[PDB]
Ligand binder design. Structure first.
Ligand SMILES: [Ca+2]
Length: 579
DNA sequence: GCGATCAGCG
DNA sequence: ACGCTGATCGCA
């Protein structure tokens, strides 16, 4: 019902200087995954190509890599990375329908061409799930069915670029797509493909010691419980703590007793066992997520792990990282932080280099709120998290432990993002009256922040959405809900999304500027990871001293705010040492 | 499959 | 009853 040429070879008219291009990769994780078919729609017609012939045709390969041959796509990073695993470079991507739809409305959850097309009342294309099936029934359909599906996705991309660009422009988001999100997409593709090398010998050695410690702690739990049970069975763990041992019930879940860490540490005065349960869980998390789980995704021949950075997922414009998630490797407890010793440079005589923004969101907040006291504080390079800890624990700066500071950091963001006296009291284990008084005092010193919180909520009610500094957008229909609890969650999104999203806009622009600078200086240094406000590179040790001056300066100059940006940086032989 | 839990980011 | 995530596990 859609006409296309099922082509046995590549012809010249498939190689126009503008085209919609589909390079179909069905597996969720696209690293080293099969390319099942290719579709091209342009001024001369619609074409399906089998990958075994198109990708071995030198004229098609050259066309893929020629940046002056413009291609419109859906999820170009997926295609570019899968093409890299075939040793083929993809250049010239000038429109990405996934990123366009994510910018117009991140809450759509647009995950295939059909869902984006529906935004514009275009429905001549099927959802990928209807074509490939789900779960165990998932499969590549017969070639005629496959070819028509890829042609229809291309034809839709061809038709939808113009109406998506028009709405992007009306939102002031067209340059956010063309100059920020699409250039970043190519950079993430390089980072994912390069991967991160892993010391599997050290990881496996840590894993075997972990298992020994796990058994020990597990046994002392049974002998403290008087009996044996399944320390991961909530019904059984609840029965031990809150029936057998008769500990107080501080919190319930939808299903029964709560046993979260916060609860367990309030019960620590009552019984020895709760601290052992915490230690047991922590060691168990290292074992299953960070030892076993990481070894499961190491590519064995290279010892590299290849994450996927999802760039059209979070509602605030942050990236997220999957399989493995390399944005939540342990760091806060010393036993957990040791995991980062297994992350090593991919060449001999190279080093890991990490640079991170200092108090990024509070600096964004001071700029956006134009709070005089908060702006003066960062003009002075004060550490607000340390000063707040000094205040909270009545200590001197000399005596601020990394953990009191991590705790104070949660108070600082909690207050600006809407924590209640009740919630602050539970976090600090203080009186609820004290908690309210402290919050009131905090807004006395920063009345511009209080004003900003009120104004941004009112602006979300009037406009229906909030925006970031680079015009990322988030719709908030619930902000006018008649239900109090639904409205409240929405008001706290209005307070938080412009701040966290603007901080995401800044690190994204820093990544684009850093890549261009590394290329200008003809250095081998390249990005490996982003962790929200931190960038991790590797480079020859010969380049470290230049990177100590180049990387902070690029990051600090990515944007100009009413306060300076500050970057801390470290390097060393493993990711552990780059801190 | 989902909710509780915990690892990270602010 | 601060916000944004992803992986694992048991299943009241
Ligand atoms: Ca930081």
């Amino acid at each position: 019902k859609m006409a296309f040429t099922l082509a046995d070879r590549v012809t010249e008219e498939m190689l126009a200087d503008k085209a919609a291009l589909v390079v179909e990769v069905v597996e969720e994780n696209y690293h080293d995954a099969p390319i099942v078919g290719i579709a091209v729609v342009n001024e001369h017609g619609r074409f399906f190509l089998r990958p075994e012939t198109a990708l071995a045709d030198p004229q098609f390969v050259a066309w893929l890599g020629d940046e002056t041959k413009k291609k419109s796509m859906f999820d170009s990073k997926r295609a570019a990375v899968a093409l890299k695993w075939k040793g083929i470079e993809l250049c010239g991507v000038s429109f990405d329908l996934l990123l366009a739809a994510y910018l117009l409305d991140p809450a759509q959850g647009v995950d295939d061409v059909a869902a984006a097309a529906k935004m514009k009342q275009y429905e001549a294309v099927r959802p990928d799930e209807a074509v490939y099936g789900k779960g165990a029934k998932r499969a590549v359909p017969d070639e005629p069915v496959l070819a028509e599906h890829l042609v229809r996705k291309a034809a839709a991309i061809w038709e939808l670029e113009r109406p998506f660009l028009d709405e992007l422009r009306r939102n002031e988001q067209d340059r956010l797509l063309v100059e920020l999100e699409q250039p970043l997409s190519s950079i993430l593709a390089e980072m994912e493909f390069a991967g991160v090398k892993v010391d599997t010998k050290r990881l496996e050695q840590m894993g075997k010691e972990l298992a020994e410690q796990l058994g020990t702690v597990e046994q002392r739990i049974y002998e403290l419980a008087g009996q044996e049970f399944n320390i991961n069975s909530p019904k059984q763990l609840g029965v031990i703590l809150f029936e057998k041992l008769q500990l107080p019930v501080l919190k319930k879940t939808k299903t029964g007793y709560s046993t979260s860490a916060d609860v367990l540490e309030k019960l620590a005065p009552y019984h020895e066992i709760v601290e052992n349960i915490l230690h047991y869980r922590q060691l168990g998390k290292l074992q299953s997520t960070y030892i076993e789980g990481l070894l499961k995704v190491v590519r064995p021949a290279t010892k590299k792990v290849h994450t996927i950075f999802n760039q059209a997922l979070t509602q605030t414009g942050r990236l997220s990282s999957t399989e493995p998630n390399l944005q939540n490797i342990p760091i806060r407890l010393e036993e957990g932080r040791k995991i980062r010793q297994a992350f090593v440079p991919s060449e001999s005589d190279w080093l890991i280099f990490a640079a991170d923004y200092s108090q990024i969101e509070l600096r964004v907040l001071a700029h956006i709120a134009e709070d005089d006291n908060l702006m003066e504080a960062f003009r002075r390079d004060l550490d607000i998290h340390t000063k707040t800890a000094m205040d909270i624990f009545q200590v001197s700066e000399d005596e601020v432990t990394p953990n009191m500071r991590r705790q104070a950091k949660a108070v600082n963001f909690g207050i600006v993002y809407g924590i209640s006296d009740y919630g602050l009291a539970q976090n600090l284990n203080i009186s609820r009256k004290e908690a309210a008084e402290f919050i009131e005092r905090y807004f006395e010193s920063f009345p511009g922040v209080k004003r900003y919180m009120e104004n941004i909520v009112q602006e979300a009610k009037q406009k229906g959405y909030v925006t970031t500094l680079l015009h990322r957008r988030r719709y908030l229909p619930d902000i006018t809900s008649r239900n109090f609890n639904v409205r409240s969650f929405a008001e706290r999104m209005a307070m938080n999304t412009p701040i966290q999203g603007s901080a995401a806009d800044i690190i994204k622009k820093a990544m684009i500027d850093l890549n261009a600078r590394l290329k200008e200086e003809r250095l081998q240094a390249h990005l490996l990871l982003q962790v929200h406000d931190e960038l991790i590179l590797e480079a020859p040790k010969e380049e470290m001293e230049r990177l100590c001056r180049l990387v902070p300066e690029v990051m600090e100059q990515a944007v100009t705010l009413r306060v300076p940006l500050k970057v801390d940086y470290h390097y060393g032989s493993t990711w552990y040492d780059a801190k």
